[PDB]
Design a protein around this ligand. Structure first.
Ligand SMILES: [Ca+2]
Ligand SMILES: [Ca+2]
Ligand SMILES: [Ca+2]
Ligand SMILES: [Ca+2]
Ligand SMILES: [Ca+2]
Ligand SMILES: [Ca+2]
Lengths: 334, 317
């Protein structure tokens, strides 16, 4: 009785599609023992019952639905047994031997892109420079590598005279201006952003976008006793805090930062104090597609200054404060 | 027949900086009433490991290097014979400092740059993996009057942005350093120098092209690199800087806009003077080479695409 000898010490067949139908071949197991037939079985690592083996041919096949997102790898032990020979002149025992089979599941593209928000709200000022950042979008999905790697594009209604309105950076999701908005205050643009995985060759998802056009008549200046570099470094967290206070008055409103600068003061606001900060903001109301009235915005922030200062404390440091809210100086200078 | 404690061994990863004699793992087999001796029978061609034939302790025998080889598969043998596989993985250590892609970055700002306007993007890399080549960036800027910070850098992206206004500072400049530190700021460091020079409209020229500004903007990095080559054959190390990309302006006082065509406003900084190249010289370098520049722009602009002219922006009309 020869102990069965596999063709390989271990098996590493090619990856198996997570969308493989039942009966799909995974790979071949082969062993021989001189003058004896061989039978194949699976002895361990097949607890989930995802594979079977044809006990005569040694073909490992898919037995049940697979899912890369539940399990990526399997390590099976297959066993080969020679069959007994009990004849008048030959008596050969059954003998067994095992071998490891490393099976890897191949990720397929079975999850479409999902945007982190269904509705993105932004704004642009009348004096925004060409290619100024408006907002950044992001879609993800549960697939791996290329199958959740996004290409972004915009679907925007026609604009006359070769103007495109906005563009999106194809791989980063950054939406930027593509025209000037002089004299367009109170206009607004509604459009869609599409994410397509496999860098634009796979599945797609979408989100809506509103960009409202404002100018200084829509804005308020938050004056803080900390440098503009601190405010700018933390601006995402600060804006999220301000959104909460505006949103308890105007549901779904989005606060937008126009600029962050030194505190301006003195005659004609001509002096700059870099130890302090002027943060110019507005808010867009998705109910109107336009900016919140700047006097209402003043009331929402000025009325809550103590609470806002408390929420800013971890960012500004203790004794960091909003000093005041004021109307932009170029407006009042009229 | 000697029976191992395990069918195969997968000990923990071994530091690529492991000293000789460092333990990798233990191999153990028993055969009743008989002593056991251990050897390494295969996969140790490079001689990186040894085994104590009595204790079964596998140890580091020579210098390792994750950047040359990450994995080893040894076959160990126990005699009183039988064998077993040992899968050894090398752990990447942080032994390459950050290296900036350029040693000297040159940029500019206009007198009317808005606060936190993008200036330029830096990037350092190194041969380590994962966290050990993942960069945190910071700036070291010589003192500026009135406590001004000058510029900031986005900690993980390398984008350098303005942090003050530059009104009336034309022909002033800032020399400073950017530091990259791997392991997100807790590991090794490298640096590069940065020059940012201050200009205004008196330093600029407008490249007028027969393609939309959206096309120019998409390709701006390659276009700027082509323009650098033409300026650099006249002024060594000069850097072309893009001030803006817009519709082609025309009509009275250049008040009208044509979005089918493009005005690309540029200037150049000369690292010899730390200041802008004279705008009339810049005009000669570009206008004199328009045919050659148009040939190099062809793959970007597409069929029939060209620079139409260079014009000088003027405040008084
Ligand atoms: Ca799946
Ligand atoms: Ca998948
Ligand atoms: Ca996908
Ligand atoms: Ca190394
Ligand atoms: Ca390393
Ligand atoms: Ca490193």
């Amino acid at each position: 009785g020869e102990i069965p000898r596999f063709t390989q010490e271990e098996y590493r067949p090619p990856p198996v599609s997570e969308l493989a139908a039942k009966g799909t071949m995974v790979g071949l197991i082969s062993a021989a023992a001189i003058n004896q037939s061989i039978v194949y079985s699976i002895v361990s690592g097949n607890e989930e019952d995802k594979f079977g083996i044809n006990n005569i041919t040694g073909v490992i096949y898919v037995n049940a639905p697979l899912d890369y997102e539940t399990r990526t790898s399997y390590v099976l032990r297959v066993q080969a047994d020679s069959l007994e020979v009990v004849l008048a002149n030959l008596r050969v025992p059954s003998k067994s031997n095992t071998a490891k089979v490393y099976i890897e599941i191949q990720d397929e593209n079975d999850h479409p892109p999902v945007f982190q928000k269904k509705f993105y709200i932004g704004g642009v000022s009348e004096d925004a420079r060409m290619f100024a950042s408006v907002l950044r979008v992001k879609a993800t999905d549960k697939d791996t590598g290329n199958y959740s790697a996004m290409a972004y594009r915009l679907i925007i209604p026609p604009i006359k005279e070769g103007k495109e309105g906005f563009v999106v950076e194809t791989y980063t999701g950054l939406i930027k201006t593509a025209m000037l908005f002089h004299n367009m205050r109170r206009s607004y643009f509604k459009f869609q952003v599409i994410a397509t995985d496999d860098y634009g060759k796979g599945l797609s998802g979408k989100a809506d976008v509103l960009v409202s056009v404002v100018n200084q008549l829509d804005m308020q200046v938050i004056v803080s006793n900390v440098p503009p570099t601190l405010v700018e470094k933390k601006i995402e967290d600060l804006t999220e805090i301000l959104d909460r206070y505006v949103q308890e008055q105007i549901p779904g409103a989005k606060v937008v930062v126009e600029s962050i600068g030194a505190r301006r003061h003195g005659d004609a606001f001509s002096l700059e104090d870099y130890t302090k900060c002027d943060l110019t903001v507005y808010a867009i109301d998705p109910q109107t597609n336009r900016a919140v009235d700047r006097n209402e915005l003043f009331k929402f922030l000025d009325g809550k200054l103590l609470d806002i200062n408390k929420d800013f404390q971890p960012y500004y440091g203790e004794g960091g404060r909003i000093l005041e809210i004021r109307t932009p100086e170029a407006v009042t200078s009229i």
